RNA sequence: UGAACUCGCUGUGAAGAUGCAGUGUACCCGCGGCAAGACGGAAAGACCCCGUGAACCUUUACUAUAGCUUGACACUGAACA
Ligand SMILES: [Mg+2]
């Protein structure tokens with residue numbers, strides 16, 4: 001079963017990672033206890049949309065934080 | 076219970092005759108008795124064989140199968156050596 005991890009999970013991956021796993025592990029533990037979700041394409045697009053929007057916020061925050069770093073040495 | 080005007084003998088004859096041939100005997104009709112015969116009555120022989128019949132029963136007959144048992148996969152996962 002392909003699933004996308006929610007919280008970080010030992011031996012698998014961190015939040016957002018995509019991993020294959022045995023159905024029974026996903027069905028009876030990881031999903032009920034809120035640790036992962038199926039790898040539905042809407043979902044993986046959801047997270048690709050997430051990874052990229054998060055990437056933009058990290059690129060632009062770095063564009064804002066650099067700007068203030070040029071201004072610190074400016075004074 | 077085919078119809079009877081329904082005797083003996085010896086012989087003949089699907090080969091054990093009231094009914095055929097030959098012959099003997101016998102006037103017509105009951106009643107009480109007897110069971111030698113009518114291969115008497117009753118039951119499409121149960122023995123025996125036959126039918127490429129039936130059934131039930133047995134088994135190391137054949138073919139299947141419930142059940143019991145084997146392993147693979149599924150429900151069925153994690154960590155650690
Ligand atoms: Mg007669």
Ligand SMILES: [Mg+2]
Pocket residue numbers: none
């Ligand atoms: Mg008789």
Ligand SMILES: [Mg+2]
Pocket residue numbers: 119
């Ligand atoms: Mg008969």
